[PDB]
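During the second half of the funding period, the structural biology subgroup turned its attention to how the target accommodates small molecules. The most pressing case was pyridoxal-5'-phosphate, which had performed well in the primary screen but for which no bound structure existed. We therefore specified the complex as follows and requested a full 3D prediction, including the ligand pose.
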Amino acid sequence: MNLDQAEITALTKRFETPFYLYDGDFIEAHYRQLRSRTNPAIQFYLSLKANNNIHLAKLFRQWGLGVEVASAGELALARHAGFSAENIIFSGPGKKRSELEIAVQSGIYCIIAESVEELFYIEELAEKENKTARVAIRINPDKSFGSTAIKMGGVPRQFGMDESMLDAVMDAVRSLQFTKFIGIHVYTGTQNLNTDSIIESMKYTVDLGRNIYERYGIVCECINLGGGFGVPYFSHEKALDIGKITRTVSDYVQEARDTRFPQTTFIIESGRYLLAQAAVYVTEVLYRKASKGEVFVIVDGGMHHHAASTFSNYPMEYIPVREDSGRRELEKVTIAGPLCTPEDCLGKDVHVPALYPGDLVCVLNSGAYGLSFSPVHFLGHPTPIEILKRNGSYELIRRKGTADDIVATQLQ
Amino acid sequence: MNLDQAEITALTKRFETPFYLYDGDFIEAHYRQLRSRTNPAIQFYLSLKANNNIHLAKLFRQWGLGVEVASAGELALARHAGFSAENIIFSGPGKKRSELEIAVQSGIYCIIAESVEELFYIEELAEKENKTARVAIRINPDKSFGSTAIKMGGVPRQFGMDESMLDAVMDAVRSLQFTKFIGIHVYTGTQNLNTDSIIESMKYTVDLGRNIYERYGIVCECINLGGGFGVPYFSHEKALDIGKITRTVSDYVQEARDTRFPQTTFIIESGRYLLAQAAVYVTEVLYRKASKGEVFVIVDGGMHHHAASTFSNYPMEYIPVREDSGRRELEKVTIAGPLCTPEDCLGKDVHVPALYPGDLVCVLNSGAYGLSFSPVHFLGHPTPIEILKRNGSYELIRRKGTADDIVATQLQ
Ligand SMILES: *Cc1c(COP(=O)(O)O)cnc(C)c1O
Ligand SMILES: *Cc1c(COP(=O)(O)O)cnc(C)c1O
């Protein structure tokens, strides 16, 4: 997203730092560029865990994406955002029966089961609710992807069910009288910057769909290719070749649609790739000090709002505001937040133009795994404002937190 | 705290897992044993950041402790808990002017300043409010403590002001007409398991008080010795010799009271030591699976409630509940929570009696840096119930979270 320093300075007169600022024009253009390159039989699904703000999620709903939820709470958020039931899928390795109950009662597109015991729970709830529950299976492939792993055969994971267990899973599936099997899901992990490994895993997932037809005579109605598209945060990281991924997977999916899967919905999921680059976290320098030969710059935001930046260094931009100093030589500094813990460090030993109280530190690539990934109540600071810029206007999409927010669960 | 397995099983019939259970009888006995060993001129202060539950904090208030707050939000919590202004101190390296304003308006015992610029902000606010503001200074000693650091002279830190800057700080202090200097504070860091290093730092802090009298003619009314008393979490860790710390520091403080400091309040702060061992985090096994030669046990709680256990392994106790299996051989397993991320791991490669759905996993030493240290809204799961056992009765001290708690700041 392009950062306008005068725009950000102006916003800090209207909104108290620290805040997240989202470029909604970039969000839309970035999504549409991805969409335009991708076979129309593939539907994109937003992973809500990457950002729990319903006003951002509503944008993707309006553009036709589905949403992937991982809890009954995220299911509620998805409905606040206006996603229809036919565009909601439910993942996760530890769904409680009460969560399965709400999912069955909601009639969502599918619950992606991660164990045989889960399948039987779903069946029991479908019977009690007099519904046909739609289920997919999350498969942990018996193959490792990329050109760097040592051992063949895939990796031990708490997620889903080993591919080697498919016969037992399909035997269970086909015995469930109130449950309809609709397909499969493979997800190889987040922050994947290896273009070829992504292509390989998605092709492998289409091929698993073929294998299920060959072995069981079932044509998957939904094949969820996962994704995990990474975003570069550090200088040594390179962006994915999104052109190569979209072209190669689109062609592989088209060949499947032309043969065995003419009415199958293919899904690519994304959280980070859709949102990370669209936001900046803006924080004001409160104090500057020297300690034992080092310089420390203390800012008004930190780990309780943006934990991921705390634990290399995120990309950052600096806005000089203080009107009295012109003493802006490059220096090595540590940028620390306001928390009473040495872990609250946005940047250690970072080489910046000299930062003084009133200057702004802007943390880039902050749109995913930001506020909701952080220990928001640690040390009792107010949760931050979030602002959405779009179509030339600015909209408050999250109010500043209050102390009453902290004690709500305690008084009650 | 002693864990009664039948008690915990009975509680899970009344309260939905996952939950925190606090032994309030242990909290009181553990505190009173510490108090009894300590010179009465030392007052203990609870560090609220270790646990933000006001019902626990109220216990310490009733026993006469002070409270150390690190934000205006924690100041509000301290007042909910009934701490009087004369028993509240305010620390932190990044206090906003709005936080300083509320602290001045509240007339608290002192604001512990961490920069000269902070001192001037406080003075300006005291003038505007027509109050005398009480301030202490946080000093970063020019000495390293223990018998393991290489370089002499102390360590670069974002906290407080280097001891070498004392003349400049005292020159600033003495120029503030609406602010009263009341003393000093040294805090060397959390989870300190080195008995002698604690004794050395506390003695050094008393000696700094003497140095301030010798150099400036000022008798500190408050000398805050900090603390950071650690608690052993892992098998290789040894408990502090609390007897040695309390006896040696009490004697050193008594010598100061008998000579130069007859009316000085000495403070020892504690969060972790007062609370860590008093709680268990109880979580139910939802699913069990094999993946690629390993066993995974998925529980209903995890990183979003108790991040510290996720990133060795905390001490854990296991309660067999499932009534059908007797297949309890020792096995190596990974215990994972319900979140859609491999980081949600309570125990990797841990050797336990075989765990089956319905069994309970109890994470010990969970009373400090627990719920409020965790990304409670990540993935949208309800925040957990907290229960206080005391005097033979059980009290709900935090209700289960709801989806409305997540969206409150977004709708509004
Ligand atoms: C985490 C998650 C996603 C989103 O991952 P990103 O790397 O943010 O795109 C997609 N699918 C599943 C199953 C997930 O758990
Ligand atoms: C963190 C903190 C404490 C509490 O530390 P514990 O190790 O939990 O006892 C005390 N004083 C200050 C200044 C702190 O920042």
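Two results from this model are relevant to the next phase. The pocket of pyridoxal-5'-phosphate (ligand 1) is lined by residues A 47, 49-50, 68, 91, 187, 190, 226-229, 269-273; B 340 (CB under 6 Å). Chain A touches chain B through 87 residues (CB under 8 Å).
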